[PDB]
Design an enzyme around this catalytic site. Structure first.
Site, short mmCIF file in Angstrom:
data_model
loop_
_atom_site.label_atom_id
_atom_site.label_comp_id
_atom_site.label_asym_id
_atom_site.label_seq_id
_atom_site.Cartn_x
_atom_site.Cartn_y
_atom_site.Cartn_z
N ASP E 316 -9.16 11.17 4.46
CA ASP E 316 -7.90 11.03 5.02
C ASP E 316 -6.91 11.59 3.76
O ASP E 316 -5.67 11.14 3.96
CB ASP E 316 -7.37 9.80 5.44
CG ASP E 316 -8.38 9.34 6.30
OD1 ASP E 316 -8.91 10.07 7.23
OD2 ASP E 316 -8.73 7.86 6.17
N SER E 341 -1.73 12.46 1.22
CA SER E 341 -2.17 11.19 1.98
C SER E 341 -1.64 11.37 3.32
O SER E 341 -0.68 11.15 3.77
CB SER E 341 -1.43 9.95 1.47
OG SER E 341 -1.99 8.80 2.01
N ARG E 342 -2.67 11.44 4.23
CA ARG E 342 -2.50 12.10 5.63
C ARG E 342 -2.11 10.56 6.54
O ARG E 342 -1.09 10.68 7.12
CB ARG E 342 -3.75 12.56 6.36
CG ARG E 342 -4.19 13.76 5.75
CD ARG E 342 -5.58 14.33 6.41
NE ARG E 342 -6.27 15.28 5.66
CZ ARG E 342 -7.34 15.87 6.05
NH1 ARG E 342 -7.63 16.03 7.36
NH2 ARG E 342 -7.75 16.84 5.31
N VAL E 343 -2.60 9.52 6.46
CA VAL E 343 -2.28 8.16 6.78
C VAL E 343 -1.29 7.57 5.92
O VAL E 343 -1.31 6.28 6.24
CB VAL E 343 -3.42 7.57 7.50
CG1 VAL E 343 -4.27 8.42 8.53
CG2 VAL E 343 -4.22 6.88 6.27
N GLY E 344 -0.87 8.18 4.95
CA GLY E 344 0.04 7.19 4.02
C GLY E 344 1.45 7.56 4.66
O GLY E 344 1.83 7.95 5.78
#
Ligand code: ATP
Ligand code: ATP
Ligand code: MG
Ligand code: MG
Lengths: 470, 55, 478, 240, 354, 119
Positions: E316, E341-344
């Site tokens: 991710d 950070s994609r899901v950050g």
């Protein structure tokens, strides 16, 4: 009933058939001794190493010498153990092949001596040391800008005419004198002429009496050229484990070890990996390197000379080799021509130990400042050549003035060079060299002539030399 | 006189910038060349081995 | 029923497989029914792989093959001097039998590390560039590497011709060449008189692959006889890449596993075996020595190929010849920068050593700053002198075909160049100056030449200077 | 074809002209049958016996005491790669070599023979004559020197050059265009009949150009001319 | 009797073939005569292919092979916290046996689509650059990629040390490292107090290729126990590059046709089925989580290579460490241009977002 | 679908002109890298000036990018796209900085930008 029988010969590969239930284990050594029965046969004295179990009571082996003259059906005997080589003080001052037989003309080792297997597992997790310790070599440039670690692996770069052998001899002499530890030299893929020359060099220098020398010559089969490093390692390991000493291990060229392994894999017929290398490249490199470690009672420090194919540092063999190194020493032909006989490049050389956590804050600061000054001096070379010295600014003048002192102070007079110079050698402690370089950086000795710093030891010898000049 | 001095300084700076750009391009092209060489060797040996074991 | 005979099962592409022959040795020599001979390489469980050393079209399935009981060997002796033979020792020049009374096995162990001595005697090739910048010593093995049509054969022929007054025996091995080319080389050697101490071994492109594979071993076996009887031998292999290609063909036909570029696993071991037999024997084993000059032909200057890499790693030095340098007027075409010798100094006399360092420095300074030829054509204090000296150095290093030069004259001309006596002479006149200086030397400076020859050291500086200005007074600048 | 030629070579003692078309196809067919014959592959997919077959074919084309066979062979180079195994192996058997370049072909120069890559062992002072050797070597050196100047010119222009390399390039262009020729078989392509030039007049014209006797002539007048009088005639017809 | 007992017919390079074992089940553990374990890989018509998980020099043709009746599994439990073990669960620190009670299979299915939840809790690594520019949440898969000697191990050790006060069990898996470096890492963790909540799984470079192959799966299986008990776990894989190299070696020893860079066809599946087992569970499943920080070593900063692209396609987001920036005095040399950070962001506290 | 009888004559011509400008810019890349724009001709510099702005205007802010960056997305009709690219090709906005063309919708948004900063 322990007898074998040659059944198939294809160049350096030999297949042997044994009685059912009495196959030899992997890596066992097999011997063939044959006396010519008539005029249509030749005498054979050959050693084989077990590699694979093919099934149907057949084993595939790799020959350690020439297979010419073999006949399908002659008797093969099993030694019941891997290759075994003599260990102890009997190996000091002697030259051996991969089989552990002496090559010089000083006779043979008696059979009553102790012998150890070539193949063994690496020391266990709980037998290793917990703290990193510095190995003091007594050479100023090495101790300052590329410290050595007990149990670490050091890569050595260079070529001919840069004093690699002289540096090796000096390392042997200094370590033996100030630590009491022996050294071992492993000539993997060694040219015979250079091996003879190195042997005579060591005999002249006198460090021969405290070193064990092993040669796997370039005309030997790939199996022997692959296994010579392991017998050198075993000879070092004996002193590491039994005497509790700190031992040096020198490998003439490790790329030749990897290429011998690749050739053995190709002969065995395994499917090639990477570009052309063996599938087990990393496994073989790890099995060789992981035995060179520091333990609770001793250590082995190894200096590898490394060849880089096609100057490509991303080639699989250099990439695998670099994953184990802790330091790096580069020898510079320009410095050799200029007159710095240690010839170690002060800027290209790097080390993992150069960190304040283990070497000391003062040492780290001094090293960083020295490197910065040397880089600053290097940057001015073209402008100095074009315009001249007088065209620079005052700060540039001071930088050049101090850097030409530092470059000369990085040199040292070696013990092994006394036979040619007449000047005795020196052993410089790390504290002494750090303090001397700090004093030079502070400008304490800017009024001294630069040639006084040429080939001296501590920071007082330069003062004495300058006073002698006047 | 100022014009000539400025012209020579400008030539010097432009030429050193061009040399630096050329060196960076040489470095990157050398990396690409090494990658291509490794790939070619791998492909050739794989094809040879496949043909050999197809028998 | 017996184990000394067999029957052929498979025939094709110059190899055969035979049933039986239970007591055949690895590498043994065998004979077929029709009289052609073969060598046994593969010993499998039920059959023997045989390579055929002659025309295989007369061999059919089912005919008999017999043991001979001898590992392959070649005849040796002084009777081979001046003859042209194949790797089996059979004469092809058509002058009758050879009449040798002794044989030596093809494969023999190399001298041990304790039987050798440090290389300390010069091998004078007669080429100024080689003798000054890439020295070769007796017992050394030096690789000559370059592309096609660059002059390697000419360098080898000049080196062989220059050994007339020395005390060495020369052996020339031709692998995979035209018989016409080999005959032309033999005619050149006969014309120059080198055929009374030279042996020629021929394996043409029409011969079976095992003969090309075996030729260099026959050459070294012939040389080792003289080496071990106390003499000095020079051996030249004309194309180790062709020898390796023939070995690869045999291995692939025998179905051994292939490696990089389809070469077998032991291709490096082959060349190591071949080249490790050149050595300088210690006084206990006799003062004999053998020096080798292997040849490798590169493709488009690629020295990263597999066989060139192996041979470079094996040999003691390299001599690089470049096509652009060859066509730019530098006919010796030796790239003095890439070339290297690891026996330098020890392979030179004192007089040559005293000037070779300055020559190397002057050439190294001129090889860089080549971009500065067009730029700064106006006067400059330093770089102009460096360029002027380098141009004259390059002009001096040029040499004509089949014109070896004595070392006592090479030393003098290099001294004259390095000490600055050529500075006031145009570049176009340098070669004429050198030729007229050589003609002047044997007329007047006979005492200097004799001093150099007898003491291997430079003559008296003032007398040499007087000779040089005396010649310069006579020389006419055009 | 070789068998038909050998009869005339041996049984009658004639001089035979053996024109062989693309040699590359013989090797290619040998490689095509190799895999089905059951043999293992080689480096670039060729048969293992490439060199042996090539030599067995080529060594029969030779001159003997009975008679002489001279052979002219066209050789295909796959994708202009001269390191290909078949052309690389063919070089060992040849006395003279003529290399054709796509760069020269695209520029409009025919026969597009590369003046530097082409080689011949007959180019010796004792074979062709000292004057011929001097002229040939001078032409080759001039062309090689001109090739170097192009790298500088491509960046800095022609004006930056001095006045001796100016003459060098000005004569090298003339030499490069004079190396062209109009063929008799190119008449179908260009509409202009071909010409035959003797070697003596070739040498004379090139020597005169090197000495600068026709330096004043326009550059384009030298294309596809033949003799040295024909470039003067073309220059007269198109002005100067 | 060839139902539960077999006989070896071939041994070579860590691969063995056995006759018999009629009732063996695919993926079972088998035991050799000398105590070395093996895995039943291929079930042929008349032989069984076995991968040897240990030193193979003691195994000879004709030796006896014995069934165990258990699929590939490793011991798990809370007794394993604070210990150094091999991928088979055998202790190597010399502090005595480990008293575990249950086990988990090495190969286990990943949580399904409906069993997961969005990442919403921050994982504080204690490194300002990471926590500010590339935040990491609980249940995220974040890749740390860079050249050799760039500080990846130091970043991992700092992250593990910082987890003292948070409720976070850490597992450190070292693949193909040097035993001396692993010893130093363990001593640093002991000095800073991390062995109260840390498990160390080690398989050094001297070990055979199958153990390096199996180490990450052992680590993730160990983590899944606490994940499914409702806790939070952090797992660090030190060289997925070396795991891939070991798997390539094994596949080539099995004579499988290689692809790009001589890697096998399933080199992507190897890493995907490993990294898919890290997830943030839903409230129905218990709310547990597992965080993975795989490492990839590049050559001269080339992230367009096969293995780097394969790993980037799975995780991710990646944190890229720059080699030339590492020499500029900035030791945590994060290249912010190539790091994401994609899901950050969602898993980041209110103040830090502002 | 990029055919004059499907998308319209002006749409086709604008697309072809944009592609031609981008191709010329791509061809100039090696010279620009080696020695910069100082040695380019007047027309080449204009080509670069137009091409950089066209390339930046080809960017857009997506609705789904709200999670990565706070900027809301935009929906752009094809008529507005064609008109904006035609205006850029005609040279109307050569004086605006090239950073104003990044991640916007209509050309009116480009005009609104470079007003929150220097115009
Ligand atoms: N020093 C020299 N001076 C003049 N001509 C030379 C010199 N050296 C070589 N040549 C000529 O250059 C050509 C090189 O041929 P040579 O046989 O020596 O090359 P080679 O490297 O063996 O190549 P190949 O056999 O593949 O053509 C020949 O025509 C030769 O006469
Ligand atoms: N923040 C930091 N401050 C100071 N030194 C640091 C820092 N981070 C790393 N180092 C040092 O830099 C070096 C990097 O080593 P580290 O093991 O952390 O990196 P790596 O990429 O995992 O290495 P390797 O390829 O050897 O496994 C070590 O000497 C470490 O002590
Ligand atoms: Mg030749
Ligand atoms: Mg690390």
């Amino acid at each position: 009933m322990t007898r074998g029988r040659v059944i198939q010969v294809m160049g350096p590969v030999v297949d042997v058939k044994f009685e059912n239930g009495h196959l030899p284990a992997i890596y066992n050594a097999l011997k063939i001794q044959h006396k010519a029965r008539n005029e249509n046969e030749v005498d054979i004295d050959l050693t084989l190493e077990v590699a694979l179990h093919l099934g149907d009571d057949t084993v595939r082996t790799i020959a350690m010498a020439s297979t010419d003259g073999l006949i399908r059906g002659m008797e093969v005997i099993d030694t019941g153990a891997p290759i075994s080589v003599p260990v102890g003080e009997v190996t000091l001052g002697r030259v051996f092949n991969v089989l552990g037989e002496p090559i010089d003309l000083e006779g043979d080792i008696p059979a009553d001596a102790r012998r150890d297997p070539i193949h063994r597992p690496a020391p266990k997790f709980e037998e290793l040391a917990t703290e990193v310790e510095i190995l003091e070599t007594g050479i100023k440039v090495v101790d300052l800008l590329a410290p050595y670690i007990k149990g670490g692996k050091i890569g050595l770069f260079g070529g001919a005419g840069v004093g690699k052998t002289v540096l090796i001899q000096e390392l042997i002499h200094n370590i033996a004198q100030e630590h009491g530890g022996i050294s071992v030299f492993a000539g993997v893929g060694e040219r015979t002429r250079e091996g003879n020359d190195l042997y005579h060099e060591m005999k002249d220098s006198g460090v021969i009496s405290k070193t064990a020398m092993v040669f796997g010559q370039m005309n030997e089969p790939p199996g022997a050229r692959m296994r010579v490093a392991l017998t050198g390692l075993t000879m070092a390991e004996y002193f590491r484990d039994e005497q509790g000493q700190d031992v040096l291990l020198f490998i003439d060229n490790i790329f030749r070890f990897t290429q011998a392994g690749s050739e053995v894999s190709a002969l065995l017929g395994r499917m090639p990996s990477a570009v052309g290398y063996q599938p087990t490249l990393a496994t073989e490199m790890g099995q060789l390197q992981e035995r060179i470690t520091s333990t609770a009672k001793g250590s082995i420090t190894s200096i590898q000379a490394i060849y880089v194919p096609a100057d490509d540092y991303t080639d699989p063999a250099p990439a695998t080799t670099f994953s184990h190194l802790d330091a790096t020493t580069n020898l510079e032909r320009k410095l050799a021509e200029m007159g710095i006989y240690p010839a170690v490049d002060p800027l290209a050389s790097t080390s993992r130990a150069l960190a304040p956590e283990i070497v000391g804050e003062e040492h780290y600061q001094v090293a960083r400042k020295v490197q910065q000054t040397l880089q600053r001096y290097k940057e001015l070379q073209d402008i100095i050549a074009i315009l001249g010295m007088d065209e620079l600014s005052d700060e540039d003048k001071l930088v050049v003035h101090r850097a030409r002192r530092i470059q000369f102070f990085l040199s040292q007079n070696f013990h092994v060079a006394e036979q040619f110079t007449g000047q005795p050698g020196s052993y410089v402690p790390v504290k002494e060299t750090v303090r001397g370089f700090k004093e030079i950086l502070e400008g304490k000795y800017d009024h001294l002539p630069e040639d006084a710093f040429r080939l001296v030891g501590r920071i007082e010898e330069v003062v004495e030399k300058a006073k002698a000049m006047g | 006189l100022d014009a000539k001095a400025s012209e020579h300084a400008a030539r010097m700076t432009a030429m050193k910038n061009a040399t630096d750009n050329a060196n960076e391009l040489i470095r990157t092209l050398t990396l690409s060349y090494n990658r291509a060489r490794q790939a070619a060797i791998t492909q050739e040996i794989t094809e040879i081995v496949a043909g050999a074991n197809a028998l | 029923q017996v184990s000394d005979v067999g029957t052929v099962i498979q025939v094709g592409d110059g190899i055969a497989r035979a049933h039986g022959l239970d007591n055949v040795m690895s590498g043994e020599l065998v004979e077929f029914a029709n009289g052609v001979m073969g060598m046994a390489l593969n010993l499998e469980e039920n059959n023997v792989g045989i390579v055929i050393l002659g025309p295989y079209t007369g061999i059919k399935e089912g005919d008999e093959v017999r043991r001979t009981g001898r590992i392959m060997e070649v005849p040796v002796g002084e009777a081979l001097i001046g003859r042209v033979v194949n790797p089996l020792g059979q004469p092809v020049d058509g002058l009758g039998p050879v009449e040798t009374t002794e044989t030596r096995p093809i494969e023999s162990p190399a001298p041990g590390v304790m039987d050798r001595r440090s290389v300390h005697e010069p091998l004078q090739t007669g080429i100024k560039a080689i003798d000054a910048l890439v020295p070769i010593g007796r017992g050394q093995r030096e690789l000559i590497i370059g592309d096609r049509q660059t002059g390697k054969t000419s360098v080898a022929i000049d080196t062989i011709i220059n050994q007339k007054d020395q005390n060495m025996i020369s052996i020339y091995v031709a692998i995979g060449q035209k018989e016409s080319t080999v005959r032309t080389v033999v005619e050149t050697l006969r014309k120059h008189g080198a055929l009374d101490y030279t042996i020629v071994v021929t394996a043409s492109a029409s011969q079976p692959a095992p003969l090309l594979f075996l030729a260099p071993y026959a050459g070294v076996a012939m040389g080792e006889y003289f080496m071990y009887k106390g003499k000095h031998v020079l051996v030249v292999y004309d194309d180790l890449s062709k020898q390796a290609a023939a070995y690869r063909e045999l291995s692939l036909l025998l179905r051994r596993p292939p490696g990089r570029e389809a070469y077998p696993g032991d291709i490096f071991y082959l060349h190591s075996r071949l080249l490790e037999r050149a050595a300088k024997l210690s006084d206990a084993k006799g003062g004999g020595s053998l020096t080798a000059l292997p040849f490798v032909e590169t493709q488009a200057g690629d020295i990263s190929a597999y066989i060139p890499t192996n041979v470079i790693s094996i040999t003691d030095g390299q001599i690089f010849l470049q096509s652009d340098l060859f066509f730019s007027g530098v006919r010796p075409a030796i790239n003095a920068g890439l070339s290297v010798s690891r026996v330098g100094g020890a392979a030179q006399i004192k007089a040559m050593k005293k000037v070779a360092g300055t020559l190397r420095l002057d050439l190294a300074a001129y090889r860089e700053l080549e971009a500065f030829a067009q730029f700064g054509s106006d006067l400059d204090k330093a770089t102009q002198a460096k360029l002027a000296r380098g141009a004259r150095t390059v002009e001096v290093l040029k040499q004509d075909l089949h014109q070896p030069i004595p070392v006592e004259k090479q030393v003098l001309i290099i001294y004259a160049l390095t000490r600055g006596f050529l500075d006031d002479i145009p570049v176009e006149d340098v070669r004429r100056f050198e030729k007229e200086f050589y003609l002047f030397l044997d007329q007047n400076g006979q005492h200097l030449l004799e001093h150099i020859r007898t003491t291997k050291d430079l003559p008296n500086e003032d007398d040499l200077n007087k000779a040089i200005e005396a010649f310069k007074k006579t020389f006419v600048v055009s | 074809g070789l068998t038909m030629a050998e009869y005339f070579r041996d049984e009658q003692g004639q001089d035979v002209l053996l024109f062989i078309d693309n040699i590359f196809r013989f090797t290619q067919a040998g490689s095509e049958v190799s895999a089905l014959l059951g043999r293992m592959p080689s480096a670039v997919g060729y048969q293992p016996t490439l060199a042996t077959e090539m030599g067995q074919l080529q060594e029969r084309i030779t001159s003997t005491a009975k008679g002489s066979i001279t052979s002219i062979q066209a050789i295909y180079v796959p994708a202009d790669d001269y390191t290909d195994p078949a052309p690389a192996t063919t070089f060992s058997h040849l006395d003279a070599t003529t290399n054709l370049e796509r760069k020269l072909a695209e520029m409009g120069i025919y026969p597009a023979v590369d003046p530097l890559a082409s080689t011949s062992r007959a180019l010796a002072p004792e074979i062709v004559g000292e004057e011929h050797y001097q002229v040939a070597r001078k032409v080759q050196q001039t062309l090689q020197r001109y090739k170097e100047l192009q790298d500088i010119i491509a960046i800095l222009g022609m004006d930056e050059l001095s006045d001796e390399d100016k003459l060098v390039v000005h004569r090298a262009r003339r030499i490069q265009f004079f190396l062209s020729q109009n063929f008799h078989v190119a008449e179908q392509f260009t509409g202009q009949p071909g010409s035959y030039v003797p070697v003596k007049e070739t040498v004379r014209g090139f020597k005169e150009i090197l000495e600068g006797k026709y330096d004043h002539l326009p550059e384009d007048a030298f294309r596809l001319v033949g003799r040295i009088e024909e470039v003067v005639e073309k220059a007269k017809a198109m002005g100067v």
